[PDB]
Each structure stands twice: as structure tokens, then as C-alpha cells.
Amino acid sequence: FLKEAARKRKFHVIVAECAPFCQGHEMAVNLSKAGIETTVMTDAAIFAVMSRVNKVIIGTKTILANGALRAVTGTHTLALAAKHHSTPLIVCAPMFKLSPQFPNEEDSFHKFVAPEEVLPFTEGDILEKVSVHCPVFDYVPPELITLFISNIGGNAPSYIYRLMSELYHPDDHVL
Amino acid sequence: KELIEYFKSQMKEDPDMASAVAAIRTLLEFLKRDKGETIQGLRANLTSAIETLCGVDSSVAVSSGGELFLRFISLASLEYSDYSKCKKIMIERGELFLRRISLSRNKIADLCHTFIKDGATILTHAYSRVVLRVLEAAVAAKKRFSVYVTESQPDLSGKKMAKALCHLNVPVTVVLDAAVGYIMEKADLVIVGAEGVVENGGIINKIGTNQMAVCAKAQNKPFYVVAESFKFVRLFPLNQQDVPDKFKYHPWVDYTAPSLITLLFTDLGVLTPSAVSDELIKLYL
Amino acid sequence: KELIEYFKSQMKEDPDMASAVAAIRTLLEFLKRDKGETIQGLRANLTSAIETLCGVDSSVAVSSGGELFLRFISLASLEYSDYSKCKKIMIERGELFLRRISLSRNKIADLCHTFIKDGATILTHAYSRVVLRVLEAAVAAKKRFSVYVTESQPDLSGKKMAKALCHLNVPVTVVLDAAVGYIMEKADLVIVGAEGVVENGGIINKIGTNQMAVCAKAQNKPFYVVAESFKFVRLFPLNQQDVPDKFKYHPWVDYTAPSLITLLFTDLGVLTPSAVSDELIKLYL
């Protein structure tokens, strides 16, 4: 979505890396390879830099039933900052990323991986006392989202329920 | 007459049962009495009965059930424009509709009881059979939680709700009507029943519900609502004054905007504040 | 003893008068009884009396008045470190302080009654002498307005306020404690009394005040507060739980954040929620 418009428009892209798995560096490099004037930064400076930002475009892992998302860790704070500054937050996700479930569940929402990425094993004896948690994903409510760009055109989160009714059958929700 | 008496009889064998379901049962039972074979005579006689019933019981649910019955008869009229086999097919469809509406409460409980977690605090305003069923199914699911009920000063029904909840071995607690803001921070979610669902998504509930929703919005507290499908009404109040005065009568009801509601648990499924408008548009009531 | 009896006597000749002013009068009157000529004996005997008085009357105003009296004695102690002429000068200064605190109510009314316009609707929660004086001065200024008072379910004092207001030939109206959100749109401003002003600017008032302030914030309604200067207390509650339990005791009081308050009408002048912190810092109480 970003590199398709760089051939006819010129803009500035800010990329916030992910603390557990710094995957934003690859995206920043791939974008700079096309001449888009990209920048890389940490999550701690999200709100500090989100006063000069004009738009936000992100990707999700799955779309829930009430229009909320299961995105990588750090997207909830991004949506909060967007809502504080009243900036539109666009979500580019195909139709196969749409799940027919509401935030029913509890605790098993996020995928927890080994704490090696957050705190290394070479710390010392403090690892027996310190409790480390490494959630990969997080929950983003629908109220902080503005638009959903899909293969069938953009739509509002308040219409995602209809897409659910259009995609899946109510008896196959539990599977 | 017989309409008043039959309504009160159905209300009295089981107190539990709501007024709108009893009204629909009375309307269908009086449908067997109909002798006229013209469609406007059936329409006017039944519409007269629904208005009289609504006069007897000033509630939004009765009017909603009456509007739904007339819309269902209008669909069964667009069947063939017959009123020769139409009355028969209509009676069968109505019986099916009544049996289907009977299971609404169980469906709502089985679908809403999953949003309650162990160790969480719930905040309810007034007594409601739907929230009671949800809580009974949650405690039936090997869950433990605490509940806070508002005393509901207009009529002391919150104490009845607390008694019925404490009877189920749950640590219930009654708070003052003016203390809804003091205990809002000690609540994880809010679940209340709705007397009637408006066109946009808001709810018409007891006088002490909109202020609680406002406090929930002020503290990012999930405000859930549980209501059946026969409570959908084609109203669109813009404020507390646009609500019809016949439903309020110290008013006895208020309107809550959909922006303060998180989700809706109905027999048709778990819905958002906007999906009800789609449903109402599909019915063309 | 004599402290309890003197407090109750001063409370009983005039009911109108608040508890903190009566407590300050009793403390100054018992100051004449003091025979010890050491400063810690005077300090401890008087501090014992203030704690006993606070035990008898569970209110934030009494504690505020006691804290202010001890701070004023500490200043009169930093006078010379004498306790030879110090007791005398202290008694004179205390008499002056009492006469000055007597006019606080009139000053607050004359300063707050100007913010009420002709034809406006006012919303009050519970009975308060300060809001009553403000309304009496406004109607004394050839003004006409309507008032809505909450019944205050914990103790039926809202009805007393409505009676005292209707006695002044004003179209008062009593609403339910759960109806604060239904009549919020029909109110132009909100004026209520404060039992105690916290360090940041919030107020400790009846249990049904924070929810009203929240509704006022949700509808951009001016929320004014009227309180005296002897009600300033060095507390900083972060939520409804940080408030001391001795003041709450179904709690009888709640805390309101300063972000929901528009202005403050005190005997020191019309102030904003932040100027009270400056005043408290200047006193070093």
C-alpha cells in the first residue's frame, strides 16, 4: 500500500520498531530501497512524535467481530495516541483476516513466548525472582479505528458485523 | 372484557414472565376468537386490543410486541392477500413464533455468560430476569464473582434483585442510587437489562441507567446490555425529552445513547449498537 | 465533660450554623479555661479536645477547623516563643478570626449570586445553607429562576431544601437521585456546597455529587461550587478509596476531581480549582 503510491506521490514515512522482535527495521529498509524517505524509531517515542503526524496505516493479524483487532504488541498505544490527537488510523487487511468472534475469551488472547527476547538468560540469579512476560499480540478496540481498507473497498468498523454475516454461517462460529 | 382478564391471568400464573410475551400470547389467543372474515376488521379489532392492552400496562415492551405482531400479520397478508387460508397459516406461524420467543432468555444467557471472568465485579442497576439468568448461568459454569446492585429508589426492586442473587450463594451488595459513582471504580463490567431498543441502538431503561452509563463511559468501563428481540421499537429519541410521555409515566424511564453501550446480547446473537438498526431496517416495521 | 456539652449547646441555639464554626467557637471558649503555662500542655489539651470533638461529629469541616486552629496557634507561637503574652494576643486574634469567619457566608452569597441569570435553571444536590443564601440573594436581586433539587436518598434533606426554597416563592422541583441524568439537559448551571476542599481542588461532598459532576462534564454544563475558607483540608485523594474512612462513615461522602469543577466561590473571592492549592501552600497547614 505504501510503495504503490510512491511512484506518483512523495511523503515521509515513520516506522516504529517492535521491542520483542524488531521487525520494523526490515520494513524500513525495504521502503528506503524504493526512495520513500523512511525513518526508524522506538515505541517509547510514539506519543512524543505523534504531534506532527497526519495519517496512520497499519496491518493486523485478525479482525474480531465487533470491529476490534488482534495486532502486534504496541498497536493499542498507537491507537490511543491517534485517538488523543484525532488522527485517522487505517487498517489494511484482506478478507481472510476476519474471524467470527467477539472479545469473549480471557488471557489466551495474546501469544506468550520465551522471555529470552525481553530479558536475556545471562542476567544472573535475579531471573529466579523477577517475573518476565513477553506478549506478542495485543487487543485494539474498535472505537479507536477509523477505516478498514480491504479488497472490496474501504468500510467503517461499524459494518464489520455485516461482513461477518456475509462471510461465515452462525452455526460454524464455534467450529 | 376478556382482553384485560386474559392479560392479567397470563401475567399471574408465572410472575417471572415479562409483559410483552404475555401480551403476544393474549393477542394470539384472542386471534382464535375472531369471527370476521375481512382483513381490516381483523386488523382493527386486534389493533384496538393492542392499544387497550398498552393503556393498561405503560411499558415499552408491550408496545414493541404489539408492533411486531401487526408487522407479522402484514407479512402474512402479503402472503397471498387471501384471509381464507391466511388466518390458519398465520396461527401456525404465530405458535412457532411464540415457542421461539420462549427460548430467547436461555439463548441470551448462554451467549452472555461467557463475558464474565472469575473474580470480576459486576454492576447492575435494577432487578431483571435476563441479568439474573445470566448470573445464574455464570455461577453454574463454576465461576465466582461479586455483584453490586442499585437499590432503585423509585420502587425497591434492587433489594429484590439482591435477595434473589444472594439466594444463589453469590456475594451480592446493595448500594445507594446516589453511590453509582463511588463504586464505579470497583466494577470490572456493567450488565443491565433493556426495556426497549430504539432505532439507533440506545436503550430505554429505568430512570437510573443513563447516569450509570455516563459514569461507565467516564471510566472506560464495559457497559453491556441484555435484551430480547421482541423489545425492538422504532423510536429515535434525540434527548431525554423526545421519549414518549406515555412510556415515562417522577419519570419511570430514560433513554441511553448507543455511544455509551459496548455490546448487546440478544437472542439473535451478540451484536453491536449499530447492528440493531440493520435488523430493524430488514424487518421494515 | 464540658467540651461535648458546649459543642452541642452551640449547635443547638442556632441550627443553621455549621459544625466547624461551632467547633472553633468551643475551642476558643475552652482556651479561656486553660491553666497550664507550658506550650505543649496547651497544645496537647486542645488537640485532645479537637480529636474528641471530631469523634463526636464525623465530618470533614470539624477536622478542617481544628487543623486551622492548631496552625493559627503555631503561627502565634512563632510570634515570640513566649506563652506569657502569647495566650492573650492569641485570644484577641482568635476573636477577630471568629468575627471574620462569621461574615464568610454573606461574602460568598454576594459574590456568587451574580453568576445567576434571569430565566435560568439551577441544579442542586442536597440542602446547604450557602446555596440557600446564594439563591435568596439572587431572588432578592429581582431575578427569576427555576431550581431542581435531588431528594438525597441517604437522608431526606433534599426535600428540606426544596421546602426552604419554595418558602422563598421560587418554583422549586424535587427529582429522584437516579434522575440526575434525565434533567441534566434542562439545567443551565450547577451550584452546590462543599463539605471540604482537598489539596488539588476537588471537593468532598454528599455521595450523590460526583456522579452529577460527571454528567455536567458530559454535557458541558457549568459546575460551580460554594464553600467557606475553614473547609480547606490537606488531603489528596486519588480516587474514591483514598478518602479517609472516618469521613465516609453505605458511605456518606465522596470525592470530586477538580477537572470537573468550573469555579469556586469562597469568602476569599471567586477562585479556580487551582488557586486553592496556592492558598493552602501559603498557609503551610
Curated annotation (Swiss-Prot), chain A:
It is found in: Cytoplasm, Cytosol. Belongs to the eIF-2B alpha/beta/delta subunits family. Acts as a component of the translation initiation factor 2B (eIF2B) complex, which catalyzes the exchange of GDP for GTP on eukaryotic initiation factor 2 (eIF2) gamma subunit. Its guanine nucleotide exchange factor activity is repressed when bound to eIF2 complex phosphorylated on the alpha subunit, thereby limiting the amount of methionyl-initiator methionine tRNA available to the ribosome and consequently global translation is repressed. Component of the translation initiation factor 2B (eIF2B) complex which is a heterodecamer of two sets of five different subunits: alpha, beta, gamma, delta and epsilon. Subunits alpha, beta and delta comprise a regulatory subcomplex and subunits epsilon and gamma comprise a catalytic subcomplex. Within the complex, the hexameric regulatory complex resides at the center, with the two heterodimeric catalytic subcomplexes bound on opposite sides. It is linked to Leukoencephalopathy with vanishing white matter 2: An autosomal recessive brain disease characterized by neurological features including progressive cerebellar ataxia, spasticity, and cognitive deficits. Brain imaging shows abnormal white matter that vanishes over time and is replaced by cerebrospinal fluid. Disease severity ranges from fatal infantile forms to adult forms without neurological deterioration. The disease is progressive with, in most individuals, additional episodes of rapid deterioration following febrile infections or minor head trauma. This is Translation initiation factor eIF2B subunit beta. The chain holds residues 177 to 351 of 351 of the full protein.
Swiss-Prot record, chains B, C:
The gene is EIF2B1. Acts as a component of the translation initiation factor 2B (eIF2B) complex, which catalyzes the exchange of GDP for GTP on eukaryotic initiation factor 2 (eIF2) gamma subunit. Its guanine nucleotide exchange factor activity is repressed when bound to eIF2 complex phosphorylated on the alpha subunit, thereby limiting the amount of methionyl-initiator methionine tRNA available to the ribosome and consequently global translation is repressed. GO terms for cellular component: cytoplasm; cytosol; eukaryotic translation initiation factor 2B complex; membrane; plasma membrane. It is found in: Cytoplasm, Cytosol. This is Translation initiation factor eIF2B subunit alpha. The modification N6-acetyllysine is found at K32. GO terms for biological process: cytoplasmic translational initiation; oligodendrocyte development; response to glucose; response to heat; response to peptide hormone; T cell receptor signaling pathway; translational initiation. It is linked to Leukoencephalopathy with vanishing white matter 1: An autosomal recessive brain disease characterized by neurological features including progressive cerebellar ataxia, spasticity, and cognitive deficits. Brain imaging shows abnormal white matter that vanishes over time and is replaced by cerebrospinal fluid. Disease severity ranges from fatal infantile forms to adult forms without neurological deterioration. The disease is progressive with, in most individuals, additional episodes of rapid deterioration following febrile infections or minor head trauma. Activated by the chemical integrated stress response (ISR) inhibitor ISRIB which stimulates guanine nucleotide exchange factor activity for both phosphorylated and unphosphorylated eIF2. Keywords: Acetylation, Cytoplasm, Disease variant, Initiation factor, Leukodystrophy, Protein biosynthesis. Component of the translation initiation factor 2B (eIF2B) complex which is a heterodecamer of two sets of five different subunits: alpha, beta, gamma, delta and epsilon. Subunits alpha, beta and delta comprise a regulatory subcomplex and subunits epsilon and gamma comprise a catalytic subcomplex. Within the complex, the hexameric regulatory complex resides at the center, with the two heterodimeric catalytic subcomplexes bound on opposite sides. Belongs to the eIF-2B alpha/beta/delta subunits family. One of its GO terms (molecular function) is translation initiation factor activity.
